[PDB]
Write a protein that binds this ligand. Structure first.
Ligand SMILES: [Mg+2]
Lengths: 85, 1111
DNA sequence: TATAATGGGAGCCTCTGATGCA
DNA sequence: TGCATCAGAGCCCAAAAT
């Protein structure tokens, strides 16, 4: 499912974190902080690891993503090239 | 100062709440203030009732509630948060077998709240949801374009709530039904509804040749089950015709209120058109095991009756505003809400299979993510959700009242022809005929008329006064276009003595057609001329004297007016400018009667009758979406007695509670040495000296410091290789200090980033070795002022990670925002306009001594070229100037209403009283007529302006009544050879300012795949030299200029490098090479399995990849 | 790695050219 | 062989896009 492939066990961990955050938001009436997710995940989990796990789980977005209500421009057109001198 | 108001028309009712189209629509959608048991089935409530019960265990909806917003509005804008409320729903899960009931209140996420002024705050930015015009649901009969004597019957439900059905009488004679692009004989569908030949023969027999086209023997032979299965096999080929499957599909197509929704407006229009009563919003019902018809037979009866020409049957005008309705904020949002709810329901059914069929709660069953996403998608990414226009208060008020035919569920721009863009006769009193965009969107984006309101069904209604006998009542009836067509409606200016019509013949409309009529024939009368036009259009004095094409620009440009530090209301107003400020919500008023306790720049404390002490904080120098400064100023003093509704503070662009979009300047209409050419404008340096047309602007700059695989970005004052000169204005932490002046190139926030791992080139190895300095690990990534920007630093916000109350997006250690303000004086290239469509850019700023001046020494402010008037036919600006002249000397301002205004005699009268002040003063001061005044008078009587034989004073007065004066050229001292029109004009500085638009690039950023320069000023972009520009170079035969555009100045990498190096070395630029995008094209065609080969004259391959891509 | 489970779901212009029927 | 019906082809530029 992911453009950047993730090991099945890591996908399992990511999804657990989703369910957990959703539980916390369902009991708390608002999105949880990193720390609240870390308590709910048990020992071994601190706020730093929740953030790092969410960072790893970020999916790319399309270069062909539209800018504007005309069909005339793409997101990639606004990205400079840092490689070529 | 004195305010003299003209006009005799008394308007019995005030303008409606101007944002009610937004505020009331959303109030009805949320029903937040209604206790749940008392809610109507509408909006959010109706969406829940539609989605539930979820059958499969059964999950049922009880009621919903909305909490309080986690953060107030000001806080949301600060923290880039959406202003929203928590949504909960009490749901009960039931096991129909066991009887077990578990009930719980589940949290569904948040829903955005509308602020007091009818807007939203979405991720910190203010947004407006634009209303969408579209075809009303219902049953229409339109003429068949192919076959003249035939018609098409179209049954239209609400968008996404069912298929359209088309009924046609085919050339073969059988009546066909078209659904989802498939056609069949309608007779089959009639048989499924349980109709028999006996009922149909007797019903439709009256229309001779058509009923036989309906008769099909084979269809009547089969019972309703066989006809239903037959239809399912026709509509869904290849799907096995299980009897339960067919019922399900046809039910979903016709009788299901969940899958098929006519409007409530759809139901009324059908009932009214066909003369029946509908039990619901579906075309038929499923009752007692069979299908029972509602709609089809009445539409068929009318369809045949139309083809046959039976009296009382008409085709429908589809651009009539009876058949066109508005979808406001509530309806649009509720639609997306309904969508998110359907997705959530899919998840529920899917969760009702898996897991334990025994232990399940509603909290375990519901995933609210689909709903949150549907709402989040609508507010951020919808086309109807727009960045609020808050250039000046009138901008957002106008934005809230705009009507679009575009957007989801609507017209595209090429697919929209003349019919939709037209001003329909029914736009009268409903949609402004003037205020629409110039260009491609003309007629597609429109504006609600001033007295117009959208009814519950979504139709625009306009007020009229009842007229009984010859007497005009004060009872106003709001009418739709359909009901307006019944009566004879007199114009609002028809003369009245008391409540009686005083004319023997009155001017009225019957179905929009103008006609002369007896007072006995008058059923209603217009409330006001104001009701025909939008609010912006209603702000143009002497509009009756302006050609509509220029009034269009006048309306639209008031939207672009910049709030000025010295802003004033116009000397000629229309009488709407107070109400606009009050509905705008920019200005601050007193709640009840009281006395002012405290007055500050920052706050005003008022003690009311109740004894309670109320404190009003004032918004000071806040940055709008467009960067204009919204700031409120206290207009009262300590100890002042105020009444209810008395002004406390002026908002932006208001002066003592009146809308102030500009300044009142002294204008001379005359050519000036070509600086006036082709709409350019000449202004006096006095305008800058006295700070007229000066405006405050604030720009927001932002920078993130994040974690990298290479180490932390740090926001720091320690930046490699920078002098103390460069760091002077940075604090300890690296943020520029408040009050510092920053110019292009200056550091705003200092930042270091860890250098990507790289091996220093042998040149750097040798350089580092020669100087004996370790190459630092970090690079200077600091945020700097872009080219052309800068100002004074007025604010800094710093947010780190791990400090109370703040959590950033993953990876971001800290975020810094720097707010930079600038006081902008008017300059060359800035754009000015008046309310009549006169617009021009400032081309010259002259010193006061060069400015044309009056005999008494007064220089004019602005010089406008008369060549702009005659082709444009906007004469209102002339009348405004004349009346403005009188007011300049009399020290007064006027209210001249639209179409009932100051007329010429009255303006002449004021001009006469003014001349006494301009001249009689001089004669007493001991000065006689000037020699040059005599010369001007000579040429003037040669022009037929003055009567020969009169005294010099008498002739000067004759010219002054024509609004012309003697004018001296400040360069020479000699007069202008003829008397010139001079007066006070209201002129605005628009949002298009050269400071923002001026841009240039030598080299800069290139694009990833094409290696061509990026676009736009913000990216340091290059100009696009496009197909048409290339044609121009081709037609000139400039081959080398063109080749440069195509290679060295763009994507030729080797070439562009070589050109730069040559120019800094003084060599001529080298011969260009292959453009990189051609290599891209070749490789893209190879990816398409086409071999593209560049060949020489011998037809041998030429390698443009220089060996790199071949093994 | 084992109660049994067996067919989906959304839907709304003009000119030119080839193709399928009198 | 001569004629509908339909599929596929097009529909300004630059600026900007907050
Ligand atoms: Mg374009």
């Amino acid at each position: 499912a992911r453009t950047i492939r993730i090991p099945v066990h890591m996908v399992e961990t990511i999804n657990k974190l989703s369910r957990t955050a959703r539980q916390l938001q369902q009991e708390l009436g608002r999105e949880p902080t990193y720390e609240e997710i870390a308590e709910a995940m048990g020992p071994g989990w601190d706020a730093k690891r929740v953030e790092e796990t969410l960072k790893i789980a970020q999916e790319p977005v399309s270069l062909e993503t539209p800018i504007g209500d005309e069909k005339d421009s793409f997101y990639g057109d606004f990205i400079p090239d840092e490689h070529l001198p | 100062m004195e305010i003299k108001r003209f006009g005799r028309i008394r308007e019995v009712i005030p303008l409606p709440p101007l944002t009610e189209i937004q505020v009331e629509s959303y109030r009805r959608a949320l029903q937040a203030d209604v206790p749940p048991e008392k809610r109507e089935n509408v909006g959010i409530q109706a969406a829940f009732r539609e989605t539930f019960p979820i059958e499969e265990l059964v999950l049922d909806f009880l009621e919903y509630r909305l909490g309080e917003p986690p953060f107030p509005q000001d806080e949301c804008r600060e923290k880039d948060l959406t202003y929203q409320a928590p949504l909960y729903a009490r749901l009960q899960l039931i096991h129909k077998d066991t009887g077990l009931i578990k009930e719980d209140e589940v949290f569904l996420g948040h829903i955005p709240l509308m602020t007091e002024d009818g807007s939203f705050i979405i991720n910190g930015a203010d947004r407006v949801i634009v209303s969408q015009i579209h075809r009303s649901p219902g049953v229409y009969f339109t003429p068949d374009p192919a076959r003249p004597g035939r018609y098409i019957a179209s049954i239209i439900p609400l968008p996404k709530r069912g298929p359209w059905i088309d009924l046609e009488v085919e050339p073969n004679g059988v009546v066909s039904m078209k659904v989802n692009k498939r056609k069949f004989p309608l007779v089959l569908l009639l048989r499924v509804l349980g109709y028999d030949q006996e009922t149909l023969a007797r019903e439709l027999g009256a229309y001779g040749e058509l009923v036989q086209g309906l008769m099909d023997e084979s269809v009547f032979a089969m019972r309703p089950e066989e006809a239903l299965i037959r239809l399912f096999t026709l509509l869904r080929p290849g799907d096995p015709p299980k009897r339960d499957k067919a019922v399900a599909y046809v039910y979903g197509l016709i009788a299901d209120p969940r899958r098929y929704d006519l409007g409530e407006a759809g139901r009324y229009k059908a009932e009214e058109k066909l003369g029946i009563r509908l039990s619901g919003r579906t075309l038929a019902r499923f009752e007692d095991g069979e299908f029972k018809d509602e709609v089809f037979l009445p539409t068929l009866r009318y369809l045949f009756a139309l083809t046959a020409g039976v009296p009382g049957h008409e085709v429908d005008d589809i651009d009539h505003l009876g058949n066109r309705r508005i979808r406001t904020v509530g309806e649009l949002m509720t639609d997306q809400f309904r969508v998110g709810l359907a997705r959530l329901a899919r998840g529920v059914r899917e969760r009702m299979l898996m897991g334990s069929e025994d232990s399940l709660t509603p909290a375990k069953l519901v995933n609210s993510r689909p709903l949150e996403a549907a709402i989040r998608e609508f507010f951020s990414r919808s086309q109807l959700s727009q960045f609020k226009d808050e250039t000046n208060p009138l901008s957002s008020l106008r934005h809230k009242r705009r009507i679009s035919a575009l957007g989801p569920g609507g017209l595209t721009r090429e697919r929209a022809g003349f019919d939709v863009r037209d001003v329909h006769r029914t736009h009268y009193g409903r949609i402004c005929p003037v205020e629409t965009p110039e260009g491609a969107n003309i007629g597609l984006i429109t504006s609600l008329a001033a007295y117009a309101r959208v009814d519950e069904l979504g139709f625009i209604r306009t007020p009229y006064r009842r007229v009984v006998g010859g007497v005009v009542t004060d009872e106003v009836v709001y009418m739709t276009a359909t009901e307006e067509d019944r009566y004879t409606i007199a114009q609002a200016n028809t003369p009245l003595e008391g409540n009686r019509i005083a004319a023997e013949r009155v001017v009225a409309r019957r179905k929009g057609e103008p006609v002369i009529v007896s007072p006995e024939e008058v059923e209603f009368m217009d409330v006001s001329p104001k009701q025909v036009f939008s609010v912006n259009t209603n702000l143009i004095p002497f509009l009756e004297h302006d050609d509509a094409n220029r009034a269009l620009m006048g309306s639209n440009m008031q939207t672009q007016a910049v709030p000025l530090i010295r802003a004033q209301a116009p000397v000629v107003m229309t009488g709407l400018e107070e109400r606009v400020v009050r509905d705008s919500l920019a200005a601050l008023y007193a709640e009840e009667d009281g006395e002012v306790a405290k007055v500050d720049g920052n706050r005003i404390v008022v003690r009311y009758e109740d004894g309670r002490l109320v404190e009003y904080p004032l918004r000071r120098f806040y940055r709008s979406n467009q960067g204009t400064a919204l700031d409120q100023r206290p207009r009262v003093v300590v100890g002042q007695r105020v009444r209810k509704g008395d002004l406390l503070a002026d908002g932006p662009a208001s002066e003592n509670g009146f809308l102030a979009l500009g300044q009142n300047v002294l204008v001379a209409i005359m050519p000036f040495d070509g600086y006036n050419f082709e709409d350019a404008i000449v202004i006096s340096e006095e305008l800058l000296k006295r700070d007229f047309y000066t405006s405050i602007h604030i720009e927001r700059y932002e920078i993130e410091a994040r974690d990298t695989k290479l180490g932390p970005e740090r926001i720091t004052r320690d930046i490699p290789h920078l002098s103390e000169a460069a760091l002077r204005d940075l604090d300890e932490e690296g943020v520029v200090r408040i009050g510092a002046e920053v110019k292009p190139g200056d550091i705003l926030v200092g930042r270091t980033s860890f250098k990507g791992e790289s091996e220093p080139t042998p040149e750097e190895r040798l350089l580092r070795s020669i100087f004996g300095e370790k190459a630092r690990d970090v690079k200077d990534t600091s945020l700097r002022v872009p080219p052309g920007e800068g100002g004074i630093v007025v604010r800094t916000v710093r947010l780190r990670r791990g400090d109370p109350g703040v959590e950033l997006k993953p990876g971001v250690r800290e975020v810094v925002r720097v707010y930079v303000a600038q006081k902008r004086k008017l300059q060359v290239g800035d754009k000015l306009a008046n309310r009549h469509g006169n617009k021009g850019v400032v081309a010259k700023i002259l010193p006061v001594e060069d400015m044309p001046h009056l005999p008494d020494g007064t220089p004019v402010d602005v010089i406008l070229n008369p060549l702009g008037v005659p082709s444009r036919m906007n004469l209102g600006q002339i009348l405004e100037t004349h009346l403005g002249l009188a007011g300049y000397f009399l020290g007064q301002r006027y209210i001249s209403p639209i179409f009932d205004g100051a007329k010429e005699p009255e303006i002449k009268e004021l001009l006469a009283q003014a001349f006494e002040v301009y001249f009689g003063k001089r004669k007493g001061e001991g000065f006689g007529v000037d020699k040059r005044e005599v010369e001007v008078l000579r040429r003037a009587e040669k022009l037929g302006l003055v009567t020969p034989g009169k005294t010099p004073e008498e002739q000067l007065k004759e010219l002054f009544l024509q609004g012309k004066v003697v004018l001296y050229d400040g360069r020479t001292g000699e007069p202008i050879e003829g008397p010139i029109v001079v007066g006070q004009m209201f002129i605005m500085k628009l949002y298009h300012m050269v400071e923002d638009k001026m841009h240039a690039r030598s080299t800069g950023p290139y694009s990833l795949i094409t290696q061509q320069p990026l676009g736009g000023k913000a990216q340091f972009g290059g100009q696009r030299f496009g197909e048409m520009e290339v044609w121009a170079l081709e037609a000139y035969g400039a081959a080398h200029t063109l080749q440069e555009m195509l290679t060295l100045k763009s994507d030729d990498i080797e070439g562009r490098n070589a050109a730069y190096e040559a120019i800094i070395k003084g060599e001529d630029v080298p011969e260009p090479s292959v453009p990189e995008s051609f290599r891209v094209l070749v490789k893209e065609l190879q990816a398409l399995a086409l071999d593209v080969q560049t060949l020489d004259e011998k037809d041998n391959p030429v390698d443009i990849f220089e060996g790199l891509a071949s093994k």
